[model samples]
Target chain A: MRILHSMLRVADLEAALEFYTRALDMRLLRRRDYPEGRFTLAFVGYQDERAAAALELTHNWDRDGYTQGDGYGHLAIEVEDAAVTCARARALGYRVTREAGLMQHGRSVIAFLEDPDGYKVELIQKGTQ
Target chain B: MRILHSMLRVADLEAALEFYTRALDMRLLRRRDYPEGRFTLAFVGYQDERAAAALELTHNWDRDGYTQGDGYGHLAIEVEDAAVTCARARALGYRVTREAGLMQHGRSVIAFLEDPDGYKVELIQKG
Candidate 1:
């Protein structure tokens, strides 16, 4: 039926949480620490879990980092103003890989921000088309 | 400020489309092929593109495969029945990595299915 969430492994849960909450304006939906499993899972998104899909950040206690493979591309988020959001992210010390601009093939204005773990987050400006 | 989509690279576009449409019961919302870039992008999901988040499958024409690193986990889909969905995926020749069962740490029932590109798909049973 509907998508629930897309999971990604994060090296630092707190840093990722900060980046997601402050930079992207997502709420900390839920977080659970599995002591026995030596890991923690945190869900963050703009909407409630029961209503919309969210992002799941899995942090293994002992793991340091993950390989930035070529397979997974990016997670896209809709925003009111991508340039303004990029400015906010930069003000918060986050990396903005792509400056907000009109897309090459579409009318949608888009920008890219790198998370604490180097995961690409695309910000699509609302009503751009 | 809502989540739009999670993009993943697939080796075969048609195979991935078939798997998502037939096995996962997602609609092919829109697709575009970049002639100069030599890549095709397809969007699939259960809801309208303007309504909810969806999955984006990018297929490079020349690229054969991609290194599925341990970083990206899986996409969770809410299904009506995990067991029946797993059985349907099995019948459709898709690999069921995890059978339907109650999660160890939660009350929700979950299952796992492997897409054509070896992407893990989690099926969370809906009420």
Candidate 2:
């Protein structure tokens, strides 16, 4: 397993983007708007996602405040086999909510899992991808 | 900015080290016991902690459990078949946490999980 990006929900997309890009010395990698979903994803990092992990800023449309409750949602990891690893998790009795599947945007094979506290974990299918 | 090493507070120092080292396939970078401070700092990582992000497990002798608000202490690692991976952890008689959800961003399936001891390892799915 490899480390990916860490997602953080923020209120001010522009301000936070500027703060990290200008103040924190991070670069804006890419962004996508989800008007219907009422959110936007801003990928910011020091370099490319492949070389370094990214800090993802998620902005919910109506949400304007960054709540600490689940502000720190999750971090990701890239792996060679999603199906094999996910199958093992289930056999071990861990909760694998969404079985392995493809994504909407990138159409990449991925799965979502969580920890004891219901915290999120993202699994990337590097080999299949 | 750059991340030095992210730390996790634990009640059992040796247990954490064993789990990360033996179970997780991570190598120990270094370890130091501060008797005067009554704590131990153990570092673990895949590559050099100096270049890549590493985990620092800290144990305080006086505390049995801890309450760290903000719920933001998680380390991210990419994995696949996430369910099976976590499932293996459970079968091994170790308590494991895992949650699954489809991502709207990519409409992709994703997993989330948590563990106690002041930290959670985020196994993110990305390409």
Candidate 3:
């Protein structure tokens, strides 16, 4: 009846976890390694999964990368200050694809960051939505 | 800071909207057409955009299809009954990729339904 989580395949679990937890300030709610499946799933979010939708990162033990086709777009995250957050992300060595500014189609101040595997993460300034 | 939405490019806005709204029982929160950009954006979700994460569908007037790479997985939705939901989805002309049953890795009952554009929608049975 409600949205639970959006799943994404990550190439590097540690790097992805570092970016999501440190750069994005999300907590590692739960993590499970499926030895039989040769994969691991880690759920991260700002709030409890029971109350809010989280992001599920699946890391395949053998796979190192994946082709991100054009169909899938960025994941938007609400932030207190997009510019500041983007600056911190850059300071942490993450790539910022788009600088913080007013969106082309909307009034929201937004920016884009690329994860370890080149997954786009959109930062929307709080109160501008 | 929290996740606001996951944006996906759709070839057909109306069809995507119909599937999410009618098949998944979500509300169309807002929609906008960008004349200059030659595209449309529609927001759909079960709760308010401010309170919960939503799915954003982007339709480019010139684009009729997209390659859904394996990198992007599926959007999971909590349902009352996985079997019933899968059945309804099948009856409504949707493709059920996985039948309702316990997940291979977990005990939770789950199923998968493909949207108009082949994007997978995971149905996790609600408690």
The residue-by-residue lDDT of candidate 3 on A20-128, one tens digit each, is 9999999999998877778899999999999989999998899988988999998999999999999999999999999999988779999999988899999999899
Over 4 Å off, model 2: A61-129, B35-37, B70-73, B80-84, B94-101, B104-107, B125-127
- In order, the TM-score of chain B in each prediction is 0.92, 0.76, 0.91
TM-score of 3: 0.96
Candidate 2 lands at a TM-score of 0.61
Tens-digit lDDT string for candidate 1 (B44-72): 99999899999999999999999888899
Give the Cα error of residue A16 in candidate 3, in Å.
Answer: 0.4
Interface root mean square deviation of every model, in Å? 1.3, 9.8, 1.3
Order of the predicted models by TM-score, top scorer first: 3, 1, 2
lDDT (10s digit) by residue, model 3, range B1-127: 8899999999999999989988898999999899989999999999999999999999999998998899999999998888888888888999987643332436554578999999999987777
Point out the worst 10-residue segment of candidate 1 chain B by lDDT: B100-109
The two-chain DockQ for each candidate, comma-separated, is: 0.81, 0.08, 0.82
Tell me how far the alpha carbon of residue A91 in candidate 1 is from the true structure, in angstroms, after superposition: 1.0
Of the candidates numbered 1 and 3, which has the greater DockQ value?
3
How do the residues A32-120 of candidate 1 rate in per-residue lDDT, one tens digit apiece? 88787788899999889999999999999999989878999999999999999999999999999999998887798999999999999
Per-model TM-score versus the true fold: 0.96, 0.61, 0.96
After superposition, the stretches of candidate 1 with alpha carbons farther than 4 Å from their true spots are: B99-109
Index of the highest-DockQ prediction: 3
